[PDB]
Swiss-Prot record:
Superkingdom classification of source: Eukaryota
Subcellular location: Nucleus, Nucleolus
Other facts noted in the record for this chain: Present with 2840 molecules/cell in log phase SD medium.
Quaternary structure annotation from Swiss-Prot or TrEMBL: Component of the RNA polymerase I (Pol I) complex consisting of 14 subunits: RPA135, RPA190, RPC40, RPA14, RPB5, RPO26, RPA43, RPB8, RPA12, RPB10, RPC19, RPC10, RPA49 and RPA34. The complex is composed of a horseshoe-shaped core containing ten subunits (RPA135, RPA190, RPB5, RPO26, RPB8, RPB10, RPC10, RPA12, RPC19 and RPC40) where RPA135 and RPA190 form the DNA-binding cleft. Outside of the core, RPA14 and RPA43 form the stalk that mediates interactions with transcription initiation factors and newly synthesized RNA.
Whole-protein coverage range: 1225 to 1273 of 1664
Gene: RPA190
Similarity field: Belongs to the RNA polymerase beta' chain family.
The protein's name: DNA-directed RNA polymerase I subunit RPA190
Function comment: DNA-dependent RNA polymerases catalyze the transcription of DNA into RNA using the four ribonucleoside triphosphates as substrates. Component of RNA polymerase I (Pol I) which synthesizes ribosomal RNA precursors. Besides, RNA polymerase I has intrinsic RNA cleavage activity. RPA190 and RPA135 both contribute to the polymerase catalytic activity and together form the Pol I active center. In addition, subunit RPA12 contributes a catalytic zinc ribbon that is required for RNA cleavage by Pol I.
Organism: Saccharomyces cerevisiae (strain ATCC 204508 / S288c) (Baker's yeast)
DNA sequence: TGGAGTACAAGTGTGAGGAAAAGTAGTTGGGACGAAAGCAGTTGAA
């Protein structure tokens, strides 16, 4: 912050307030709609013959 | 009964020897407490 005035922070974050009518089950479904999903994450095996 | 030759010693010049403790002659030994970060004008080619 004080030195270097870095536009490239190591861990840039963003805090998102959710509404007062949206629930926790609706919000956990919502976090999945944003997060990056590699194709690696859904693969159990790759068998190559 | 006088002289002709002649070895024994009194007597006279030439250099050659003797010695030592000082110095100097050739080899070998030895002398040399530093494998740091995000960042920026220049600068890579697209």
């Amino acid at each position: 912050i004080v030195m270097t005035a870095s536009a490239a922070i190591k861990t840039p974050q963003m805090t998102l307030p959710i509404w007062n009518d949206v629930s926790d089950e609706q919000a956990d479904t919502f976090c999945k709609s944003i997060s990056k999903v590699l194709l690696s994450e859904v693969i159990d095996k790759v068998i190559v013959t």
